[PDB]
């Protein structure tokens, strides 16, 4: 009756240090719809984070895009922390910028 979220963390454009971009965390395939998503900068929750309106796929599973404007450096590392009723502990997915 419940489905655990799939998670992708990625940027809107290919990342270049010093150039402004958007950090995305896309959560999908989950049911029910209550979900908690944080974007992390060096382990710290980012305050400015907007998200899309709740929608769903043909299999009734929900999806949401969380995003924030950000400027990549080689120094800062980013991640997306997700909790859902299906998850015992929050799941953290690191952004891999060699993709």
């Amino acid at each position: 009756i419940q489905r655990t979220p799939k998670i992708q963390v990625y940027s809107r454009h290919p990342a270049e240090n010093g150039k402004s971009n958007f950090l995305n965390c896309y959560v999908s395939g989950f049911h029910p719809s209550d979900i908690e998503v944080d974007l992390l900068k060096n382990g710290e929750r980012i305050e400015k984070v907007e998200h899309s309106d709740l929608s769903f796929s043909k299999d009734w599973s929900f999806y949401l895009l969380y995003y924030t404007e950000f400027t990549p450096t080689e120094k800062d590392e980013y991640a997306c922390r997700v909790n859902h009723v299906t998850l015992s502990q929050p799941k953290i997915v690191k952004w891999d910028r060699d993709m």
């Binding site: 009756i1 489905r3 799939k6 992708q8 990625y10 809107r12 454009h13 290919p14 958007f22 995305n24 896309y26 999908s28 395939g29 049911h31 029910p32 719809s33 899309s52 309106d53 709740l54 929608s55 769903f56 043909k58 009734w60 599973s61 929900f62 895009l65 995003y67 060699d98 993709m99």
Partner: protein
């Protein structure tokens, strides 16, 4: 090309935390253009695409009144579903609805849709004939009987053949610079050794619209379907989408692999290799 208009309703109960939340979103193809959220400070049907904004106050009043009515109906539906499934009043439950119309290049109706779910499982769907129903279980059979008695399918058909296609054609014209423009993918192949004898080839597609795309890896010209890691198509947040496809290949065999890309914005399918 062909186009679709879809509306999506989600009604979610939350016993002890007030009345059920009702959210509606509307799409033309992969572009969202309206939202209604009963939890908003001042709930109204609201624009989410610039081309809908030119609709006047009568439009927004009409849509808002309809969403408020629908929200009431679906809150009652949530109560009704409790009794149909012998469920307690302490649980949270969700009703989902998707409906709308697809048209072809000429704007003629291709097919209509009206499908509902309860707790993420099929509940009742309008068949393609837009005259009969498919009920997923004995609960939905009760709704089916009610809808047959009330000739609900006849009402939906009138909407799907009429207003739905008329409004879709109008939106397609008002948004022709974006809704009727396909952006082809920007593509490239990356290469990363895993070990001394294996490497990952990843085929990338960025910046494309609409979301529908096909990325396939071939080895010596044969599809590597079973062997390809294929990530879900994902929104970039500027209207466009992204996807990649990856395969693990033996070191030294990289040129035996080709990535194949199909997208509406491409006049012909692309073939790429690692360079």
């Amino acid at each position: 090309g062909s186009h679709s208009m879809r509306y999506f309703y989600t009604a979610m109960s939350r016993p002890g935390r007030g009345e059920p939340r009702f959210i509606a979103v509307g799409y033309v193809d992969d572009t969202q253009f309206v939202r209604f959220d009963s939890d908003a400070a001042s709930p109204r049907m609201a624009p989410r695409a610039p081309w809908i904004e030119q609709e006047g106050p009568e439009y927004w009043d009409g849509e808002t009144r309809n969403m408020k009515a629908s929200a009431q109906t679906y809150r009652e539906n949530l109560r009704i579903a409790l009794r149909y499934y012998n469920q307690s009043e302490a649980g949270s439950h969700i009703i989902q609805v998707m409906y709308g119309c697809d048209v072809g290049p000429d704007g003629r109706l291709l097919r209509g849709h009206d499908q509902s779910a309860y707790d993420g499982k099929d509940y009742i769907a309008l068949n393609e004939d837009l005259s009969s129903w498919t009920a997923a279980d004995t609960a939905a059979q009760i709704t089916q009987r009610k809808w047959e008695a009330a000739r609900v399918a006849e009402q939906l058909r009138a909407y799907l053949e009429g207003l739905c296609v008329e409004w879709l054609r109008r939106y397609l014209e008002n948004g022709k610079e974006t809704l009727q423009r396909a952006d082809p993918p920007k593509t490239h192949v990356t290469h990363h050794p895993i070990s001394d004898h294996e490497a990952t080839l990843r085929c990338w597609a960025l910046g494309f619209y609409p979301a529908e795309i096909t990325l396939t890896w071939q080895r010596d010209g044969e599809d590597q379907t079973q062997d390809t890691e294929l990530v879900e198509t994902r929104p970039a947040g500027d209207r466009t989408f992204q996807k990649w496809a990856a395969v693990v290949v033996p070191s030294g065999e990289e040129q035996r692999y080709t990535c194949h890309v199909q997208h509406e914005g491409l006049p012909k399918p692309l073939t790429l290799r690692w360079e």
